[PDB]
Structures are given as C-alpha cells and as structure tokens.
Amino acid sequence: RALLDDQARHLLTEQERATMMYYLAQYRGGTISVEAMVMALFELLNTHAKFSLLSEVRSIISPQDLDRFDHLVLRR
DSSP, X not given: OHHHHHHHHHHSOXXXXXXXXXXXXXHHTXXXXXXXXXXXXXXXXXXXXXXXXXXXXXXXXXXXXXXXXXXXXXXX
C-alpha cells in the first residue's frame, strides 16, 4: 500500500488521488468487481505517466482476481 501511495502522490493531484483510493476501497469492500474498478481507473488515468500506476494497483488486488485484472490491463 506504501509503494502505490508514494507513486500516486507524485503523479496525481489530491482530488485524483482521492478518486483512486475511493474506487480501490469500493473494490476491497466487495461493492464493485475488479473489472468495474479497472474501467473507473481508465477514466481517471488519462496520461502515459498516470497509466504506470496500474502496475502498482496490481500488487494490492486479491490474488484470485489477478487473471481478470491482467485480461483488461496490459502488463508491459
């Protein structure tokens, strides 16, 4: 959770960081699927540098959801 929070602070505004943390908490809370979370992040992460945050997000999602995450989020 530290590698992501550190990276988000450098690449996102406070408001954009609040949006990312909101969707991540909705996903962790079981309200939304990993796919709904990914789609929300695609709407938030508009620049090339911002897209790099999804590799940090990958490290904090449930291991059983990694294949679904990778199916929508390009790994390299």
